[PDB]
């Protein structure tokens, strides 16, 4: 499932509007990527299917804070 | 909480026997009684070899509505409506006239 | 050992018939209407206890119920079970 584990981003639905304003339903997918994050405390790598916004979030808050949030959310990693 | 019971002597208020008296033989669950000797019909009884009935025109008693009968008050010689009271913590019947307990 | 209460609920009735009279007088076999869940061992123990008689073998069959019409309304009778109980020779039963 195209879900960022960190931010909870999700494929949303919208429209392709043409020049003649013809509306067709499309989707807006998140830029998800699987990345191994070095956790220094547990001294191991943890793979997360995370968006690039979430990678900026981990670079700002730190990965320990985020894995605390995922445990408080009740999400496996 | 039934006013007219089994062994009671009643008089007939309405019908082809308006004024006759008799004893109740049994009361039915449909709100009807069979009074001894009153609502006589002649049933054409079919013979049965089993049960040893030759089969004939048997005259017997039909049921009648309780509303059509009333308890004969042998004191006054008339019909009286029936009320309920408690005597000794026990629900008894009494005549509405003269407030006398039905026995 | 089968419990006596079950052995008392196994047997329902004797089945009277021309075939039953023949099997009783020739092969010394009684014909019983039994409970539907009753097995052959339960039957053999019941006859050996409640009638005090020695059973050689038990043959069973299931009787399918007939489809009847009471008036014009359809209906179906119950399936019941029938046991041919072969007694040993010399044994006798009412």
């Amino acid at each position: 499932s195209r879900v960022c584990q960190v931010t909870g981003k999700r494929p949303v639905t919208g429209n392709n509007r043409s020049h003649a304003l013809n509306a067709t339903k499309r989707r807006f997918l998140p830029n998800l990527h699987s990345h191994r994050f070095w956790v220094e405390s547990e001294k191991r790598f943890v793979t997360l299917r995370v968006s690039a916004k979430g990678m900026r979030v981990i670079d700002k808050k730190g990965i320990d804070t985020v894995l605390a949030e995922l445990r408080a959310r009740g999400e496996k990693y | 909480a039934a006013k007219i019971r089994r062994d009671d002597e009643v008089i007939v208020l309405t019908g082809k026997d308006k004024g006759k008296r008799g004893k109740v033989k049994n009361v039915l669950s449909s709100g009807k009684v069979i009074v001894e000797g009153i609502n006589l019909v002649k049933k054409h009884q079919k013979p049965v070899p089993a049960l040893n009935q030759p089969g004939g025109i048997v005259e017997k008693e039909a049921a009648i509505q309780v509303s059509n009968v009333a308890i004969f008050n042998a004191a006054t010689g008339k019909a009286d409506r029936v009320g309920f009271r408690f005597e000794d913590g026990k629900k008894v019947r009494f005549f509405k006239s003269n407030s006398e307990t039905i026995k | 050992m089968i419990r006596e209460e079950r052995l008392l609920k196994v047997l329902r009735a004797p089945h009277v018939s021309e075939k039953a009279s023949t099997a009783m007088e020739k092969s010394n076999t009684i014909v019983l209407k039994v409970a539907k869940d009753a097995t052959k061992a339960e039957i053999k123990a019941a006859v050996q206890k409640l009638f005090e008689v020695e059973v050689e073998v038990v043959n069973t069959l299931v009787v399918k119920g007939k489809v009847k019409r009471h008036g014009q309304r359809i209906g179906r009778r119950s399936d019941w079970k029938k046991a041919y109980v072969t007694l040993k020779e010399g044994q006798n039963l009412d």
Binding site: - | - | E4, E5, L8, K9, R12, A13, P14, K33
Partner: protein, 62 residues
């Protein structure tokens, strides 16, 4: 008869239940033939068995 049967033991109730069931068997075979001409005894027995099983579930496990 629940009042009478309450003043009994567990083994006495089991004895009565087993005598009831023997009577129920002998009635059922008697009515299987045309011998039984008191049909109400089957009902009386079926209730009395129910009273015994009831009191056994009261005295045991309750």
């Amino acid at each position: 008869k629940a009042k009478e049967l309450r003043e009994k033991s567990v083994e006495e109730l089991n004895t009565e239940l087993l005598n009831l069931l023997r009577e129920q068997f002998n009635l059922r075979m008697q009515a299987a033939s045309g011998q039984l001409q008191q049909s109400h005894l089957l009902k009386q027995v079926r209730r009395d068995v129910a009273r015994v099983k009831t009191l056994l579930n009261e005295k045991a496990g309750a």
